Symmetry: C4
Subunit: 394 residues, 4 copies
């Protein structure tokens, strides 16, 4: 086993093809499937896996009550092979966690899981299934991380964490690790900005992240850093807002540097992603400007470098009559593709239950996964598909 | 790992011995088993696997309602070891799919799964579990494929697809791939003919296919092609019709070149198979001429080359009091047999529920699998065996 | 991988220690566990597995109705790791089968499974999971085999089959195979004798079998053969009868050559085992002389060579207040023990339901497994432990 | 594969970070999870596993009735990957057992399981899944062992067993084994002392054990021995009692040599652990002095060598409003950590049901696991989390 380089350029893609759909909630109507949320995908040299935060309880069981709640001692990071339901018998335990990130360095799996009290949480770093290091909360205010794949290059793995208020200035840090040990860290200066739940991917030896601003921005923060943790921080330049909530495109003016908000969009957001394509960008967003429903991906001409409103391509993978949720980025390594570039992929979380579906006592999600290809691909609507309410709700 | 040659001659066999029976629906009365249809078997260097199209739902669950329906965003191609039920905890996710084919090239599994809207579907090609390529619908009319094993020879894998009307002239294409990338394609000129759901196998370096004509033929199309995708197309010469519906043998006159139909047999069919045996042929068919019930296999003397009605051997593996369905061909590679020829095998789908059993809200199937041997083997009736209706039907 | 020699002498043992108990029926009260019977154990170079004949149905499900029945198209030979319940998600499919034997030659698993009609059954031989050969019924009267491990030595695997009446003179054959192909066979001349369900093991390069006489003998047939299939046949000499039904010891006089019966013991029996120990023998038997209840193993001084009634050791592993059933022999290869002799082990089937427990609609069994050790070991009573009737019975 | 040295010094640690939580009882409300107790963790070269004693029955099933009972023929030692629920489909069978220990020598798993009658029990030693040796009861009074990981160094594995009265002078023995064969044993002279359920770990080539005195001591016995089975025996010197029941710290005076008890603490106890840290000690204990509730770990300055009451650090991992139970020690080998010292870890059993929760008919437990790290780590309360009573209790 050797470390994955992962220093190749990101592939330029013209479309996204569906790779998997787990149908976990449909299956969990009768099968034994964890209540989850915050799923994500990460790939190693030979396989991709779906990670997720369980609620330490199964669908259609009484312990699924009140699972809209974000943090508890019962939540765990676990994984299954890509496409499998997050079920009770295939799930691989990764970490105790109510917030997490994971990735593969070419030799072993790295998993970072945060648990503990809101005012004194800590991340446990697991490497090859063994606990190796810890990161303590430095602001004592809900230490939290990506809820998507971290990035490994040349044997070093990188991720972003936040600590501090949800709706005002917080603290943002980049971490570097080798074989599960933290070897470097850097605080990101971002006055007036807010960074959470970064979706990051490798691109020509740098880590590029598209994040969530839960404060004053309906545009998404962009964070780019190198192996030294030297960084650039700002916002996705595009004159098309991609957070939720947001306003209609025509009411929005882009900015490369400033959080753009107001108009009832402040103080919330949703995890999302984008992929740089030279000077352009593929960016995902919910179809609804106000709720987590529908999902589409847009190719915005020069959207990485200027306040462009030029949409070159748009593909819908979930119509606005169906519930979405988080989305995130990952890449497929050269060892699986034999290519000279890294294939950009994204996953989509489809949340069922509370708060949108009040007649259910629970909250869970299922996923779809899509990967970039060199040609245009039609969209469709691959919805969660579960019929609610469930037995336990009656 | 090396590519499988698969250029050996097909074995001549005198009988078919039962290899497996999954009893999936019986088990699914209580166990957690997917609702499926369109099962098939494919073999790699070291194991054979049963593939199937799920309905993204389990037996005896409410989500099994209306599963007679052919296409949805919830259907997936998955696999289990040969003989296992298609259950929720062993199933390996292969592709999103409401139509599919899969095979092993000696190094990795190839899976081709079609999803999307009827008027803009696309196949995603998965190789070693990674998405590698896409094939878009070229006629925008339910792009569809074999529902059985594709064929790999010398590192290249081949399959047949159709796009166009179900009951009139459509378009038929052969595809060639290497490591999951389409490297060649050829449209098959077949005016007045109709090709669907080809059952294909290697024979002395060529691919031989026996298909379904859903238009004017109660006889089965034969398609034979080489590595260049140069092809011969026509019908199984035998003066014994093997599609369903069909007429009694004595009311049928064979043709090597023309669809032979009429007499209330037009506009439907069922997936089936045949194996060339020199100039003769082993061909499967339902026992009923009008419904998918019973199953028998016939050795027809010179049936590959002339309109022979001479039945040399006949073996029944399912009596006409029990439901059948699709059947398909595969081969066992030399790496498992140590032989100098490729062993012909077939599987049989046994459909339960709608439309024949109206008191059930669902449709699924189970399977039996048989392989050719050098001696005569007695038949029997290995029926699905489930007792309907199920709990969910009441 | 190399073929196992298995030509070492059988170990002399002074006691039997419990190795596993699967508790399958207890577990199956709620878990998803096959209805089975005729379990047995066989060992490969690196693991031992429990094989069993399913009824193609799960415990506590309606399809378990009438599972007292011996033969159906739904029965399959499957296996799990030693000690596991025969459950729906770990079970490995081996063969379609209502009668079977299996063993490992050092390179691959051999499984022989008989299915088909009573008057035209056939065994399918599976090697490394691939069908390799067939054995047809030669008397057309319920072709049947050991229901325990076959024996492999130097790359050749051997087993015994019977065809003919259950309660009068039948036909008995020994088979030799290499890589799943039958390479030799020999009919055993045994006029007035009856052989079924042989429990066989290797001992100094010969195969020694202890069988069931279902005709005129309450003593057990002994069959010993070499690689040429040259054989000796007779009865266990001991003046202690070990079949069930039988009479009390004091009413029995042994014979090395003749079936000894009468006194209401004719026309039935139970699968059992014995291990030669020089001139002595370890022999198992039910505690009850009339029913399949309790289980004990006896060391009979010189019991292999003369009509001895001298019981040197007796160990009970199941008291007579609990149901037993079949028992059978296997050995542990040198590759697992590092010893110079083959360790004798036995398994015990504990049948629940019909016919002894009439208030249940089903019949299944669970198992315990014991291996010989160089010292005396106390007995106990490790009963099935399930509480009947089950939910499905009400 | 080579034998693990395991002769390194134990790491000095300043805190304990949570590594896993299985949530087994929560999951078992709907999933198929064994009723268990006496869980423990042991690590091999490449993975850690959770071992447990099942009751041969599943949660929420009628066979869970009366599982407060300690010993039966249905109990088995099984294992799952660290963090998994002890479920019906992942559980690996290890030994028949109502008392057990297990560990990995670098090449294979060793498992020691005791079953049989109270007055004639015996341990079966399993090595690489094969039975290798037996240890008989020498006092004929509930032969019993650690209920936690044994210790392997340089290819030899060591464990402690007890035989004799629960509440008066018993007999205590140390065992040494190589490849599953007992190669040495030594009786420990400890007049007036009582040793049960030792928690042992390697430290600089010696085995250090912290045990339970079920007779006259509310302080814990310490047993230290070398490869010759030469030993030192006494009590944890600290002037802080760590058994349960016990008295408040201020009412206790330590002793290195004598059982300190009385004040209603005699004749009971609970399995616990401690780790030497030079002259100091990390010791676990329930928060309650009288019941198995809460759990905390204390660093006591010089507590290994003198009657110190100086508590340097205290971390609570379970508050006193929640049920605890047994706790035990294990280490992570250098092959997983790349360190020069052995990482000390502990697990915590959280018992639900009888006797504390009388409205449940059953008793089971779940676990949390923590490993030592080089920095201080905050505590929290990671409770079992199941909501009782369960369905089966109503
Ligand atoms: C507190 O809410 C944060 C998180 O947001 C939400 C949500 O669906 O929007 C899900 C998470 N749930 C979990 N990851 N478990 C959160 N993050 C946490 C740590 O609660 C937010 O980003 C503001 O800080
Ligand atoms: C539309 O019907 C087609 C297919 O036929 C049927 C059937 O049981 O006969 C099952 C399929 N179900 C699936 N493979 N899911 C079909 N094929 C599709 C793509 O629907 C037919 O061959 C005509 O074009
Ligand atoms: C027909 O009865 C035979 C078998 O005996 C019985 C029984 O519990 O005694 C179980 C078997 N069940 C299965 N192996 N399935 C039988 N053997 C068969 C082939 O039915 C007997 O040995 C006489 O020929
Ligand atoms: C008899 O009680 C002993 C054991 O203690 C208890 C308990 O929760 O305290 C659990 C065990 N349960 C099991 N390991 N199954 C016991 N040990 C046994 C062998 O019963 C005790 O240590 C006195 O000898
Ligand atoms: C969920 O919690 C609410 C509030 O306690 C309760 O009223 C309801 O009955 C619970 N549902 C279940 C299934 O326990
Ligand atoms: C992607 O496109 C950009 C803009 O044309 C170009 O600079 C870059 O080389 C491309 N990357 C790859 C991997 O083709
Ligand atoms: C199946 O669908 C039909 C039509 O909506 C409905 O009447 C019936 O109740 C459904 N059955 C179940 C179990 O949901
Ligand atoms: C099969 O039979 C045909 C016709 O006799 C013959 O040409 C061919 O060689 C045979 N194939 C094999 C593999 O034996
Ligand atoms: C079992 O079969 C008998 C006879 O047909 C029937 O009376 C009984 O109801 C069946 N039990 C179940 C659970 O189907
Ligand atoms: C078993 O005992 C017999 C009788 O003493 C003896 O001939 C034989 O050598 C022994 N076998 C072994 C393997 O010790
Ligand atoms: C548990 O055992 C008691 C005593 O026999 C009995 O009263 C109770 O009904 C049992 N509960 C169950 C679920 O069997
Ligand atoms: C642990 O600390 C003790 C006391 O200072 C010291 O003697 C020992 O060397 C330390 N062990 C390690 C592995 O650092
Ligand atoms: Ca926002
Ligand atoms: Ca037709
Ligand atoms: Ca008899
Ligand atoms: Ca005590």
């Amino acid at each position: 086993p050797e470390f994955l380089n992962n220093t190749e350029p990101l592939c330029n893609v013209s479309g996204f093809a569906i790779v998997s759909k787990d149908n976990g909630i449909r299956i969990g109507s009768r099968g034994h499937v964890f209540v989850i949320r915050e799923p994500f995908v990460a790939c190693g040299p030979t396989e991709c896996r779906t990670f997720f935060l369980t609620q330490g309880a199964l669908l259609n069981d009484k312990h699924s009550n009140n699972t809209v709640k974000d943090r508890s001692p019962y939540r765990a990071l676990m994984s299954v092979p890509l496409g499998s339901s997050p079920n009770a018998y295939q799930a691989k335990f990764e970490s105790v966690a109510w917030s997490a990130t994971a990735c593969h360095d070419g030799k072993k799996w790295l998993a970072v899981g945060i648990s503990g009290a809101d005012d004194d949480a800590y991340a446990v770093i697991h490497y090859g299934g063994m606990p190796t290091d810890v990161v303590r909360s430095w602001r004592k205010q809900i230490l939290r991380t990506q809820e998507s794949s971290c990035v490994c290059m040349n044997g070093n793995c990188y991720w972003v964490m936040t600590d501090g208020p949800a709706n005002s200035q917080a603290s943002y840090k980049i971490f570097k690790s080798h074989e599960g040990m933290v070897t470097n860290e850097r605080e990101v200066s971002f006055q007036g900005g807010h960074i959470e739940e970064c979706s990051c991917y490798p691109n020509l030896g740098k880590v590029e992240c598209v994040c969530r601003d839960n404060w004053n921005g309906m545009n998404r923060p962009i964070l780019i850093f190198d192996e030294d943790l030297d960084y650039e921080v700002g916002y996705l330049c595009a004159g098309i807002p991609t957070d939720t909530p947001r306003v209609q495109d025509s009411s929005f003016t882009g900015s490369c540097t400033n959080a753009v908000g107001g108009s009832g969009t402040n103080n919330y957001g949703v995890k999302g992603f984008g992929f740089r394509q030279g000077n352009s960008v593929w960016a995902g967003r919910t179809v609804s400007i106000s709720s987590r429903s529908g999902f589409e991906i847009l190719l915005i001409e020069d959207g990485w470098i200027r306040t462009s409103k030029t949409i070159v391509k748009k593909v819908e993978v979930l119509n606005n009559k169906n519930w979405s949720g988080y989305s995130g980025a990952f890449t497929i390594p050269i060892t699986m593709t034999s290519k000279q570039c890294l294939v950009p992929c994204f996953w989509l979380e489809m949340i069922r239950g509370k708060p949108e579906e009040r007649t259910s006592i629970w909250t869970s999600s299922s996923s779809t996964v899509f990967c970039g290809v060199s040609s245009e691909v039609p969209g469709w609507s691959w919805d969660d598909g579960a019929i609610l309410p469930f037995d336990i709700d009656k």
